[PDB]
Amino acid sequence: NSYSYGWSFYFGALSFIIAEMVGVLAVHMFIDRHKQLRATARATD
């Protein structure tokens, strides 16, 4: 009744961590863009 998960199982699990990291990095780019866009707009005002 014993079992052991293989490398393929650990590839999907490892994909989840990388995907979440990319999501954080993608949101941080969206945040930085708008911050730069607002900073420039304020300076022109």
Binding site: A13, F16, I17, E20
Partner: protein
């Protein structure tokens, strides 16, 4: 020799020196939950955050 009917029931069996009871592992505090739950809690922790 002319045997008779079995008066009792037996069967080959392995005898080993009774291995003394073991000490709960150093990480026994993870026993209450299966390894799958601990793995998924980490995923949930990352996903929620």
């Amino acid at each position: 020799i002319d045997f008779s009917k079995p008066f009792m029931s037996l069967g080959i069996s392995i005898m080993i020196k009774k291995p003394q009871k073991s000490k709960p592992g150093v990480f026994s505090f993870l026993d209450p939950l299966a390894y799958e739950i601990w793995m998924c809690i980490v995923f949930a922790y990352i996903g929620v955050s």
